[PDB]
Design a protein around this motif. Structure first.
Motif, mmCIF file in Angstrom:
data_model
loop_
_atom_site.group_PDB
_atom_site.id
_atom_site.type_symbol
_atom_site.label_atom_id
_atom_site.label_comp_id
_atom_site.label_asym_id
_atom_site.label_seq_id
_atom_site.Cartn_x
_atom_site.Cartn_y
_atom_site.Cartn_z
ATOM 1 N N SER A 149 43.737 51.169 28.624
ATOM 2 C CA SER A 149 45.045 51.953 28.551
ATOM 3 C C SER A 149 46.198 50.736 29.710
ATOM 4 O O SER A 149 44.930 50.125 30.491
ATOM 5 C CB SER A 149 44.978 53.406 29.309
ATOM 6 N N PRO A 150 47.324 51.032 29.047
ATOM 7 C CA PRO A 150 48.499 49.585 30.575
ATOM 8 C C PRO A 150 47.366 49.847 31.702
ATOM 9 O O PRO A 150 47.727 48.671 32.176
ATOM 10 C CB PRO A 150 49.360 50.798 30.377
ATOM 11 N N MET A 151 47.233 50.980 32.416
ATOM 12 C CA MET A 151 47.089 49.965 34.186
ATOM 13 C C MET A 151 45.659 49.839 33.771
ATOM 14 O O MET A 151 45.674 48.873 34.849
ATOM 15 C CB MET A 151 47.049 51.506 34.416
ATOM 16 N N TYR A 152 44.552 49.887 32.802
ATOM 17 C CA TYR A 152 43.661 49.516 32.845
ATOM 18 C C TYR A 152 43.923 47.623 32.058
ATOM 19 O O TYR A 152 43.081 47.003 32.991
ATOM 20 C CB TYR A 152 42.774 50.020 32.399
ATOM 21 N N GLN A 153 44.671 47.468 31.169
ATOM 22 C CA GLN A 153 45.011 46.303 31.146
ATOM 23 C C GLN A 153 45.555 45.059 32.378
ATOM 24 O O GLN A 153 45.087 44.387 32.410
ATOM 25 C CB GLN A 153 45.899 46.222 29.943
ATOM 26 N N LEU A 154 46.384 46.046 33.347
ATOM 27 C CA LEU A 154 46.540 45.096 34.079
ATOM 28 C C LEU A 154 45.941 44.480 35.383
ATOM 29 O O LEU A 154 45.806 44.040 36.008
ATOM 30 C CB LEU A 154 47.904 46.324 34.645
ATOM 31 N N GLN A 155 44.972 45.957 35.741
ATOM 32 C CA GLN A 155 44.003 45.461 36.301
ATOM 33 C C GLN A 155 42.715 44.244 35.644
ATOM 34 O O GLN A 155 42.069 43.888 36.577
ATOM 35 C CB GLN A 155 43.003 47.135 36.192
ATOM 36 N N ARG A 156 42.350 44.219 34.712
ATOM 37 C CA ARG A 156 41.512 43.200 33.982
ATOM 38 C C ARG A 156 42.100 42.287 34.120
ATOM 39 O O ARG A 156 42.069 41.245 34.044
ATOM 40 C CB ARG A 156 41.400 43.914 32.551
ATOM 41 N N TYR A 157 43.932 42.029 33.892
ATOM 42 C CA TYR A 157 44.502 40.856 33.937
ATOM 43 C C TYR A 157 45.213 40.094 35.544
ATOM 44 O O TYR A 157 44.147 39.153 35.362
ATOM 45 C CB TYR A 157 46.002 41.107 32.833
ATOM 46 N N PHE A 158 45.145 40.888 36.053
ATOM 47 C CA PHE A 158 45.088 40.321 37.400
ATOM 48 C C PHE A 158 43.990 40.527 38.248
ATOM 49 O O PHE A 158 44.332 39.406 39.331
ATOM 50 C CB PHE A 158 45.991 41.112 38.337
ATOM 51 N N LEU A 159 42.868 40.991 37.936
ATOM 52 C CA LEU A 159 41.408 40.413 39.124
ATOM 53 C C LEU A 159 41.196 39.043 38.575
ATOM 54 O O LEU A 159 40.649 38.346 39.930
ATOM 55 C CB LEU A 159 40.595 41.784 38.024
ATOM 56 N N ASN A 160 41.091 38.788 37.333
ATOM 57 C CA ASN A 160 41.405 37.643 37.497
ATOM 58 C C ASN A 160 42.502 36.972 36.160
ATOM 59 O O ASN A 160 42.082 35.250 36.307
ATOM 60 C CB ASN A 160 40.186 37.224 35.766
ATOM 61 N N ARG A 161 43.612 36.845 36.874
ATOM 62 C CA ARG A 161 44.628 35.795 37.608
ATOM 63 C C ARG A 161 45.290 36.266 38.122
ATOM 64 O O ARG A 161 46.668 36.647 38.099
ATOM 65 C CB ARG A 161 45.734 36.415 35.762
ATOM 66 N N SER A 162 44.688 35.966 40.045
ATOM 67 C CA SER A 162 45.179 36.326 40.943
ATOM 68 C C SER A 162 46.564 36.212 40.707
ATOM 69 O O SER A 162 47.770 36.607 41.907
ATOM 70 C CB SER A 162 44.606 36.403 41.728
ATOM 71 N N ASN A 163 46.757 34.488 40.567
ATOM 72 C CA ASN A 163 47.660 33.821 41.362
ATOM 73 C C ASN A 163 48.597 33.949 40.330
ATOM 74 O O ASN A 163 50.584 34.004 41.136
ATOM 75 C CB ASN A 163 47.743 32.251 40.616
ATOM 76 N N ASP A 164 49.517 35.067 39.322
ATOM 77 C CA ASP A 164 50.501 35.165 38.742
ATOM 78 C C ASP A 164 50.707 37.093 39.799
ATOM 79 O O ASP A 164 52.299 37.078 39.408
ATOM 80 C CB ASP A 164 50.074 35.651 37.202
ATOM 81 N N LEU A 165 50.259 37.009 40.173
ATOM 82 C CA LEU A 165 50.583 38.290 41.142
ATOM 83 C C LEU A 165 51.253 37.428 42.003
ATOM 84 O O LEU A 165 52.287 38.333 42.612
ATOM 85 C CB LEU A 165 49.150 39.906 41.075
ATOM 86 N N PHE A 166 49.826 37.131 43.319
ATOM 87 C CA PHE A 166 50.556 36.400 44.152
ATOM 88 C C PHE A 166 51.810 35.712 43.830
ATOM 89 O O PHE A 166 53.074 35.882 45.379
ATOM 90 C CB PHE A 166 49.210 35.518 45.152
ATOM 91 N N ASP A 167 52.083 35.159 43.092
ATOM 92 C CA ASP A 167 53.238 34.203 42.750
ATOM 93 C C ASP A 167 54.472 35.269 42.883
ATOM 94 O O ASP A 167 55.207 34.662 43.631
ATOM 95 C CB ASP A 167 53.144 33.426 41.517
ATOM 96 N N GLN A 168 54.084 36.529 41.925
ATOM 97 C CA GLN A 168 55.506 37.465 42.256
ATOM 98 C C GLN A 168 54.958 37.879 43.383
ATOM 99 O O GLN A 168 57.015 38.780 43.699
ATOM 100 C CB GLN A 168 55.544 37.894 40.928
#
Length: 168
Positions: free
Chosen positions: A108-127
């Protein structure tokens, strides 16, 4: 109490009210998400890292955490950013979020996002953005490496491990 992956939350204040909403995220897709509305505060925990989260609709306002193993600090911060449904977090996604669970279904979308950002934190921290560290004595700022720093992830602060009452 509730769980969001490794994240454990206990309500401190506010009321839990959720409405389904369509959200245009950073990869240009529309996601249907139960968006929480209202000011809320939580005790939060991931591994040995504990903190206090203050948030409002799609907005992480403040996150105070303790010093801990760096992997637990970083996961706590990322999970809180995602759990808060912050607009900067939605805008950080690139490419498709189409991860499958072990049953062959889409997360589901919130868990897509959890999975995406736990393993690609720089995409989050950059924004997310950086601001000047707080200069209140008990708090310090934290950078992307979970080190004490003169700049900090916006709204995130860390307590020092101090023997306040000279217990030793």
């Amino acid at each position: 109490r509730q769980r969001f992956g490794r994240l454990e939350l206990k309500r401190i204040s506010g009321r839990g009210f959720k409405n389904d909403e369509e959200i245009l995220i950073g990869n240009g897709t529309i996601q249907k998400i139960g968006i929480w509305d209202g000011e809320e505060e939580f005790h939060v925990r991931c591994g040995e890292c504990r903190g206090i989260l203050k948030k409002s609709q799609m907005r992480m306002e403040k996150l105070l955490i303790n010093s801990a193993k760096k992997e637990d600090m970083k996961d706590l911060i990322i999970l809180c950013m995602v759990f808060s449904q912050d607009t900067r977090m939605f805008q950080g996604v690139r490419g498709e979020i189409n991860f499958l669970n072990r049953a062959g279904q889409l997360l589901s979308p919130m868990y897509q996002l959890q999975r995406y950002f736990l393993n690609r934190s720089n995409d989050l921290f950059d924004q997310w953005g950086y601001e000047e560290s707080p200069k209140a004595s008990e708090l310090h700022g934290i950078n992307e490496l979970m080190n004490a720093s003169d700049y900090t992830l916006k709204g995130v602060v860390v307590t020092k491990n101090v023997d306040h009452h000279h217990h030793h």
